[PDB]
Every structure is written in structure tokens, then in C-alpha cells.
Paper text:
Despite large sequence variations, all BRD modules share a conserved fold that comprises a left-handed bundle of four α helices (αZ, αA, αB, αC), linked by loop regions of variable length (ZA and BC loops), which line the Kac binding site and determine binding specificity.
Interestingly, most of the 43 BRDs tested were highly sensitive to modifications flanking the Kac mark.
Author numbering: 1047 to 1070, 1071A, 1072 to 1160
Amino acid sequence: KIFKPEELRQALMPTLEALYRQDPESLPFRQPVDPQLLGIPDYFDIVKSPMDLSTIKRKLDTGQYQEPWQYVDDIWLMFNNAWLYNRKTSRVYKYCSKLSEVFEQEIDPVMQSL
Ligand SMILES: [Cl-]
């Protein structure tokens, strides 16, 4: 179906809030990564399409997702970036896995309703 932007926003936003409210796990994902500041110059060599919670929120607010799967894809892109760039024993890697689990429980019922 064609999705009215506000209908989408209303359905998806709670799932994004749930991730944002995961403390401390969501902390590393609330703002775009800044390799200059963080002193990790090689970040963009590894991560070709940066994504994060704030960017996803902005796209959601500005009606830039026409369909639910698009939002899901951005969520997974964010996760995959973190798993890719961070060692599997790192804090960020584990935070990422936790967010992944929270998302799964959140998104399933929502997708059905859409
Ligand atoms: Cl949107």
C-alpha cells in the first residue's frame, strides 16, 4: 500500500524511541560518528554509508521514508556498520547486539500492522 507519512511516523517512532531509551546501549548511536574528533581516521575507509539514530529520526520527521522496509534497512545499516567496524569484544559491538535484540522485539508487531 501507499503510506501516508504521518501514519508511518506514528507507527515507527515508538520503535525508534525504544532504541533511543536503551541506556547505556544506545549512547554510541545517538549522533553521527565524527572520526576527526574521536581520533579514528580510518572509520570512513571501513564504513561507506554512515547511519545513526539521529539521522534516522530526521528522515522519519521529514517524510523521507516512503515505506516501512526503508526504515528497517537504515536501522540494520546502523547495526551492521557497528558490528563491522568494532571488535566483537568491544563495548560498542555488544551495545549494538543489545539494540539489535530490542529492535527485533519492537519491530515485528509493528510491521504486521502495516
Ligand atoms: Cl518518514
